[PDB]
């Protein structure tokens, strides 16, 4: 395109010129022809579409049904001939309340984390400096067009995608755009095909660290490469959560359930004598019975406190579903420049005294240092820091060395960086010893060159020091200092420095000689002028010091949290726009490759074979680079994943990132990314999980992203995996400790219209159960402890591990909740009975009871009863009822502490929050039993003592049978129990 | 989900297996709940109920009962006897059992006072009960007027008070009915009632109440309100009160605790 044509065959597509530029009129005519340039803003969403959005999901439609089946019933009955419908209106009030407040919290916590993520981003206007019929002038960078000539300088940002046509020195950062972590020189020659791998070629963003350069505008606004990235990415669509997937699971569970047990009791309202009318409006309140209500803000509330957990380790969810996909995650799919590395050229290797030394690269300095006690390396501190122009900004003190801001190379800021931590005051150092000589860096010579003064006055001999490229500085040097002796070069020397200098390059490293040349008091007396066009002072016959390479080293916690996450069951992946051989180094640094894994191109190095003659099942690791994708079919690169544990992706395109995702999603994988630059972005968006840095994210990563790392650090990917899995387990106790109670609400209302007995519980009592009691207790299970070691388990699998599952349904319905209801049965009968009415006698009572015209029905001791007595037993009724519930599902909240351990082995008072919740759920029910104005407000009658005991047994034999068949389940792992009865 | 050879998720065998184990798990918890409810009926009480909670003062009803949609309204037409043939038949239906036939299995009484019994002395180990006999309401007893008055259009009303085992109304005087217009006519005087018993009350040997099963032939003590000068073709509300010493009517939530409250129109 615009970098393999020439200046003759360009200048012509844009009516421009490569000298002056363009004509004014022209530019007009092209800014009208095409936008300014810059980014179209995206479209985003209105605040009332974004609240509209929270009242969606599979239990907000479930809720929505039940309601309008509510008002549905309440227009049949009230049609017909029904009073006392008040009921279905307390429903459907009841579950759009909870519906609209669930969304109001939801839509809560995504304005605060977008209030936190948006505040660390800022505006600054840019401006950029353009060339028009020769003239020069500073522009705004949105006043740009195709064809315009722009000067572009060290520190200013490109403003545009342009063909270079002249530099000098030019060096840009393209690490956010592409994946290079080092500085990239900017030439007027093409040298690759593609655009974005040639050095022709500057990218609108990328910051100009160096140097000067001239060129014209080629591409502008949305069609610039980041603009093309940004266009990939909204055409990303981002799918459903694992965790909105499990609950859509259990809304189908609960939909089959009552459609099922509707149309059975249908058919026997009919068996029984009902009519059509009546059996509908039956099989419809039993299919919005078994709807919870309270349950979507049980769980929305724990997922709050999960994300109020992560947000105190500076890990911010945009939304509340993304807590638990880390914990679901089975590969994570990781970005190397800036993500696992600290986006920065730190000192990493020293080679002095015939040894490969390791230098600290950590950005806290929390690690193993080198062995600094020799004459060698006391000589080669002072070369490199000596021979060095880079400079601290003023007023940096507290801020710590590796995170000041320096002003000059990348290079020479790494140099300076690692005098100040292992020397000590290298401005002090550096002024001590004036410079009376110096020669910049050209590429003629390849080398930097400073004369200087020793800090003693006695000694007058003038230091020359020298830095510059390995070989370049060899070719000089007839000796090396070796241990603190000045030895010559006997080919053994010159072989022992190759072999150093290659494999620091294989090490993915850029290496730097270093040497000193001390200059006799006779030849160079003080005060000799030194000429640096006279070449007068010798630059041949030095004495080599050492070797030093740098690198972008990774993060500090890198290595162990991806260590953990290994160990966690978790496929890593690196996917990298950089160098394969830095990629591959950086791998092995941080444990994405394992020791002694060896890739195909290393089996066939130690075999003498060529490549395609070795196995590729022999080797555990594997590098694919971005050439070898394209030529890639989806079958192959299936192959290639599963046959390569450890992969590394190099030279990987945004386009090529999304694809690799998309695969791994494909073999049916829930997956996690990591990214910092706008060239994840869509693979970020793509993730079952965008994870992005904050400090170091660009902004389009950030809005792509479903979690922000405040404060880069990457152990809070293991911190996240952690509190999914545990979140995932509470959950399922909390889930379960809420569906038990369903049944003992729905029973008595069967047997009610069945058996025709005055009505045991009421819709006022159900709801208080559903909403006030039972909603802290529920959520107090999310603070329960793993009950093994979470993070040694493997991923769950998506197909067959469900948040709700057969086993947990039946047991906690038609097992414990039956339990609860013979509990209230018991409860409900003595009452009755002790005030005069026996089981027979309720049978069949319905009628007379709720009759407005009889007003002395006889009980079983013949005493006669008015409507208005008949209704407060019926209240002491509900009352019963909802005390044996509230007294089982303390009982209930005790077993659904753990699915396999004991109460006993798990503690009973280890959950403060749990002891709370039970003590407040007791307070509660006496506040409702015996509050004044309870029985004609809510229907609550002070009941007796004794009505509170019937029920305790029967909560103690909950305890007794869930513990018992704990038991059976951990004494006999695989068993039929353990395959039946376990949850 | 369905298929051949493992039907929903389970094989047939293992189906088998869980089934048994529901049924048993659900016959244990049926027998559980079938010893409760033997143990709650060995310890009541046969002729005490172990509570009066929602019985603390008995309710009041009238005979003849027509309710409109609020409560108690009768309305009917002296020149048109069909609009009272029903009100007669309710009142003769309700007096049957108050015939000597239907008191041959109560005793007279004449104390005038508690008939307390503190042991089973009547036939069948049961207590003796009073008798009272539907010729105890002279005028309003259905004889020699079969109408009750509602030809004349001076209508009888029978009030029943509820009972209640072992409840005492006051042993100061005999507990009685009041009945008076809930709000005055302003123009006509307030309302003239004769009472039979004479001044309506009901005897203290009618008490107290031992229920069904000591007392399997007791029947409840009536009286009977006259009403004499009723304004015709014109609504009234009337509210009949059981004066006594343990019975109250101010309950709020109650309208029949104590007292019976209902409407009444006469058309010429
Ligand atoms: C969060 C959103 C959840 C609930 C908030 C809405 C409140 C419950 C939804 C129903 C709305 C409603 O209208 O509910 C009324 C009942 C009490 O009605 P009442 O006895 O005053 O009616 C007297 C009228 N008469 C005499 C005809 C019966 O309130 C109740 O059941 C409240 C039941 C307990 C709710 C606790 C919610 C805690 C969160
Ligand atoms: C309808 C219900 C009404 C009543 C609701 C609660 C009212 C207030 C009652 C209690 C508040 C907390 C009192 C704490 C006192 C004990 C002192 C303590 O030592 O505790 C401090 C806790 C420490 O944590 P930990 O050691 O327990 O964690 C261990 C487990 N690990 C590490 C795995 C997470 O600090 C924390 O937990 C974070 C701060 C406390 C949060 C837990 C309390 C529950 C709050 C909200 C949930 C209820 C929502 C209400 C209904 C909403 C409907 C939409
Ligand atoms: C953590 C442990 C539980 C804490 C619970 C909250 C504690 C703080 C709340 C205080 C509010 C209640 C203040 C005291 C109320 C009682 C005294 C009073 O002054 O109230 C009297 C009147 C009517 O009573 P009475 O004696 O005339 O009727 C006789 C009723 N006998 C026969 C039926 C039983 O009550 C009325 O009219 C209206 C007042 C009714 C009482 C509140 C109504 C519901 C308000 C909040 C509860 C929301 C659901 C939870
Ligand atoms: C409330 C009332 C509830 C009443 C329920 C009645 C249940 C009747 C008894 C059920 C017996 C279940 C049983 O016999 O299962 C035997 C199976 C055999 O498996 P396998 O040897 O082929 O597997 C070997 C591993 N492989 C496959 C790799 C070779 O599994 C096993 O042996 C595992 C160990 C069996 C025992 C586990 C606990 C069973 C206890 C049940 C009592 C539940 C109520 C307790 C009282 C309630 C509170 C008062
Ligand atoms: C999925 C499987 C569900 C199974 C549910 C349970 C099925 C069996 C339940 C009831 C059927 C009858 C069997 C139980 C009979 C009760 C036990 C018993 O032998 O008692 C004896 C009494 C007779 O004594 P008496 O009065 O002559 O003595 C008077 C003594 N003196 C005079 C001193 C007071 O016989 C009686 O009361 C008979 C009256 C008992 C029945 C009352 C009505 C029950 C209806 C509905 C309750 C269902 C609850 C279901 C909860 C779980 C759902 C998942
Ligand atoms: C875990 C922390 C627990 C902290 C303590 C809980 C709060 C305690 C505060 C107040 C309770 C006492 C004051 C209210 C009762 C007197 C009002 C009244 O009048 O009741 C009277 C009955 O009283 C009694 O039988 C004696 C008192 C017993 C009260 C029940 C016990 C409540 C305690 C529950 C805690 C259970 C804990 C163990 C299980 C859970 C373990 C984690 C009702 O009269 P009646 O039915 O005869 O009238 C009927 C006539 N009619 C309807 C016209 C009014
Ligand atoms: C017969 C009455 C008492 C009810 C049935 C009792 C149930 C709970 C008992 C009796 C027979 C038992 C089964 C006997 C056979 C098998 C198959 C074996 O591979 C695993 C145990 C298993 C699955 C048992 C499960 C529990 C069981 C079904
Ligand atoms: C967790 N679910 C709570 C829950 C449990 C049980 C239940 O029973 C139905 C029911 C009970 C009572 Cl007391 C009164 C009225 C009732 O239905 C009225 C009705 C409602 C919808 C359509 C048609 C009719 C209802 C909700
Ligand atoms: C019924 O009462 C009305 C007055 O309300 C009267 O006109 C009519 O004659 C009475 N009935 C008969 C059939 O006499
Ligand atoms: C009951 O006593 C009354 C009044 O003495 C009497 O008239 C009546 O005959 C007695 N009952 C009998 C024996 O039928
Ligand atoms: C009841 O009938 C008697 C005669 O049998 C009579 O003296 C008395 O006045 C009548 N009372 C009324 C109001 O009918
Ligand atoms: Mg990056």
Known sequence: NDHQLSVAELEQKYQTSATKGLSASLAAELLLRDGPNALRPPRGTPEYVKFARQLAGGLQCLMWVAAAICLIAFAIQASEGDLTTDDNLYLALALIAVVVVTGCFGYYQEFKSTNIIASFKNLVPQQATVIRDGDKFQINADQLVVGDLVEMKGGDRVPADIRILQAQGCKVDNSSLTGESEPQTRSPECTHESPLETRNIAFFSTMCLEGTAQGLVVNTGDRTIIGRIASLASGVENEKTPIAIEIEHFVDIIAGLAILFGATFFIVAMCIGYTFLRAMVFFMAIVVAYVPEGLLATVTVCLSLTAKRLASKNCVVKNLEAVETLGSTSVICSDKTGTLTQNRMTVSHLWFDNHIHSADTTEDQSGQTFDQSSETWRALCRVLTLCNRAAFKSGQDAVPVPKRIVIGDASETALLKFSELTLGNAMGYRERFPKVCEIPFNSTNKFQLSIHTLEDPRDPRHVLVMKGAPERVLERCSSILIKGQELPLDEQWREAFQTAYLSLGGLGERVLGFCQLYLSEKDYPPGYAFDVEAMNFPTSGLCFAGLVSMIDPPRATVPDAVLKCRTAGIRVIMVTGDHPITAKAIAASVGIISEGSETVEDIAARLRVPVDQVNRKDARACVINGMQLKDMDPSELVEALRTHPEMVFARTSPQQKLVIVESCQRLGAIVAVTGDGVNDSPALKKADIGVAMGIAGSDAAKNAADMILLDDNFASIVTGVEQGRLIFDNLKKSIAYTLTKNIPELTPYLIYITVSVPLPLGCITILFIELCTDIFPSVSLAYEKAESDIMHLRPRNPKRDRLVNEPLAAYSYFQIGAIQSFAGFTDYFTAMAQEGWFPLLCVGLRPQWENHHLQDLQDSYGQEWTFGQRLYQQYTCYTVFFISIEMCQIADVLIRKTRRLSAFQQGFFRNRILVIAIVFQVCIGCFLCYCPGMPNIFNFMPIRFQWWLVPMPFSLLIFVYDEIRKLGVRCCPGSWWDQELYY | ?268
């Open chain 2, 1 to 268: 989900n369905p298929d051949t050879g493992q039907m929903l998720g389970r094989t047939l065998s293992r189906w088998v297996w869980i089934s048994l184990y529901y049924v048993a798990f659900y016959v244990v918890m049926s027998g559980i709940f079938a010893l409760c409810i033997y143990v709650l009926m060995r310890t009541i009480d046969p002729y005490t109920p172990d509570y009066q909670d929602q019985l603390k003062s008995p309710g009041v009803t009238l005979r003849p009962d027509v309710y409109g949609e609020k409560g108690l309204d009768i309305s009917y037409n002296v020149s048109d006897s069909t609009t009272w043939a029903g009100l007669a038949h309710t009142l003769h239906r309700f007096l049957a059992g108050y015939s000597p036939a239907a008191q041959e299995g109560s005793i007279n009484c004449t104390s005038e006072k508690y008939f307390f019994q503190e042991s089973f002395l009547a036939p069948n180990h049961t207590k003796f009960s009073c008798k009272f006999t539907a010729d105890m309401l002279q005028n309003c007893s259905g004889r020699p007027d079969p109408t009750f008055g509602f030809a004349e259009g001076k209508p009888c009303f029978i009030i029943k008070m509820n009972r209640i085992v072992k409840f005492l109304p006051g042993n100061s005087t005999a507990p009685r009915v009041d009945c008076a217009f809930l709000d005055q006519p302003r123009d006509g005087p307030p309302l003239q009632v004769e009472y039979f018993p004479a001044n309506g009350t009901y005897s203290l040997h009618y008490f107290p109440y031992y229920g069904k099963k000591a007392q399997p032939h007791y029947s409840n003590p009536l009286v009977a309100a006259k009403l004499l000068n009723v304004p015709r073709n014109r609504d009234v509300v009337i509210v009949c009160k059981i004066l006594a010493e343990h019975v109250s009517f101010d309950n709020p939530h109650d309208p029949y605790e104590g007292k019976v409250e209902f409407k009444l129109k006469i058309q010429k």
